[PDB]
Amino acid sequence: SLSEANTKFMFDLFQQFRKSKENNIFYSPISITSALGMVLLGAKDNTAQQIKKVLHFDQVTENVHHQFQKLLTEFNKSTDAYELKIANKLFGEKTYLFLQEYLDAIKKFYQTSVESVDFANAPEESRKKINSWVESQTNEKIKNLIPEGNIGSNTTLVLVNAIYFKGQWEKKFNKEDTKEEKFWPNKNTYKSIQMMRQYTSFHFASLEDVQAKVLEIPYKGKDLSMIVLLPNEIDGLQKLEEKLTAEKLMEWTSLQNMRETRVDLHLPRFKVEESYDLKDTLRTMGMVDIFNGDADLSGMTGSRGLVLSGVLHKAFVEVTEEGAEAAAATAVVGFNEEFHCNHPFLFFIRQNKTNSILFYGRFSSP
């Protein structure tokens, strides 16, 4: 199952991300999968086999690219209550020729469009053009995706994925009920925060065992939901993080294993913005040939010689009384019950029909 593969890669990412100093974590695993999927399509031999393993695409069954193409289709839908959109794009050096085969394949499986830019003579201005396209696909929430240092006059390829979601809560919060309260990042310390509050019935589950609770907060239309995992104890997050695997997430957070239940939901207004340099991270995870001289990306060009210089990700979420807005992008460069979220919690945004986790995060502090 592909949904499962993507969710496993999501946890493999999370364990790496835990090592940086940043308190909050927020990223789109699907955006990253999509960008690396476009790289895989042009990879060969061992270069390809390492990518497949990192993405868990070697564990999907029946061609994976076809299954991903079906997913991409589902992720482009707007109603009156929400917008979800995803796009893939290839920016190549103007004078540089890709295999028609490779172009047809990314067009077909990843809906990728192609734009030619002048990296050779204008690498800085090319950088800024890619960064603006990304703004343009993210309601301007992802700015400066690719910082200086990453594009040069020898750059021949930047593959980019952008994903954007904005949706209304099915049951909105009343701004009149929002109040300043303390948020405790640790047992013995606090920061002020605007706490939204409502009493309503939601699918709920108590996970007595990791000493946590789970809540589903639907978006209007119920195509998407935000799932939140709240440790029972102020300091219990570290255990929950150790025990939450893809298999456990799938069990605990399915409708099947939750129940409609009335909850004083207290959820803070919050905003998270984070950046990731993914090169060394993916290297650790198993993707080595692609970043060095062994690289085989001859499926892109017809011969070896292309190597990836970087992989960058940036992500944004904001939660308000009306709903939530979430965005991310990835660049690859080549050459009765209470649920009170007043201490750290995990959250994610899921597309319910496909069971896909589009965005995943940890809120540790305002």
Swiss-Prot record:
Keywords: Acetylation, Cytoplasm, Protease inhibitor, Serine protease inhibitor
GO biological process terms on file: autocrine signaling; negative regulation of catalytic activity; negative regulation of endopeptidase activity; negative regulation of JUN kinase activity; negative regulation of peptidase activity; negative regulation of proteolysis; paracrine signaling; positive regulation of cell migration
Cellular compartment(s): Cytoplasm
Protein name, UniProt field: Serpin B3
Gene: SERPINB3
A molecular-function term among this protein's GO annotations: serine-type endopeptidase inhibitor activity
Organism: Homo sapiens
Domain of life of the native organism: Eukaryota
GO cellular-component term (any): vesicle
